[PDB]
């Protein structure tokens, strides 16, 4: 029988007004003999009709993958509205329903602190620039780095770790050439989270 998986929108799509967030209802193990799948979408119980079906995709393992996409309003998602996707198909004795929404809990503003490399590190080829993002809730966040308005892609960010106070924290490490850091260059930690003023804040790091 078919299986269903309901995915939330990307953090950046919900936090940036210049983007369009969407919920994706994925149906796997759809059979070749009965691929007709009916979707019924609800938002807080009220049925909606603006969803679109993505083109069917052959998986080559004897099944299809049928997907429905529902566009959501930034404020509707951020306000904790619930999205339910009901999936009906002939091979399904009874319709399958999945529900997803933002994590419930009072949102808390992340504190962002940039931390320079250790004195002991000043002898290696490349130095590490740290950015501590703590005290945030929910865990939905986006962290990036830049210098002179240009994006720095040489970084790794730990997944959010649940702190002892019910909030989340994480660390992001950007690795650069000692020269750059030594020269006084300015590097920044860009963080996007719903609880920040304008869902944004930048923290600079240099000498």
């Amino acid at each position: 029988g078919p299986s269903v998986f309901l995915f939330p929108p990307k953090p950046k799509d919900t936090l940036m007004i210049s983007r369009t967030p969407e919920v994706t209802c994925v149906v796997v193990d759809v059979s070749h003999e009965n691929p007709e799948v009916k979707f019924n979408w609800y938002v807080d119980g009220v049925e909606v009709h603006n969803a679109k079906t993505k083109p069917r995709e052959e998986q080559y393992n004897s099944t299809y993958r049928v997907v429905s996409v529902l566009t959501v309003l930034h404020q509707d998602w951020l306000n904790g509205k619930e999205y339910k996707c009901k999936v009906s198909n002939k091979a399904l004795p009874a319709p399958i329903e999945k529900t997803i929404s933002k994590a419930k809990g009072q949102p808390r503003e992340p504190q962002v602190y940039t931390l320079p490399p250790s004195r002991e590190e000043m002898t290696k080829n490349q130095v590490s620039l740290t950015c501590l993002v703590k005290g945030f809730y929910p865990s939905d966040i986006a962290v990036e780095w830049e210098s002179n308005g240009q994006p720095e892609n040489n970084y790794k960010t730990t997944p959010p770790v649940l702190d002892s106070d019910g909030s989340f924290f994480l660390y992001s490490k950007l690795t650069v050439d000692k020269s750059r850091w030594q020269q006084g260059n300015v590097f920044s930690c860009s963080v996007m989270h719903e609880a920040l003023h304008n869902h944004y804040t930048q923290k600079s790091l240099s000498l």
Binding site: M16, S18, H197, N198
Partner: peptide, 13 residues
């Protein structure tokens, strides 16, 4: 006021 990420509009209060 507004916030911009690499030129892109993020949000405005």
């Amino acid at each position: 006021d507004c916030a911009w990420h690499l030129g892109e509009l993020v949000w405005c209060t």
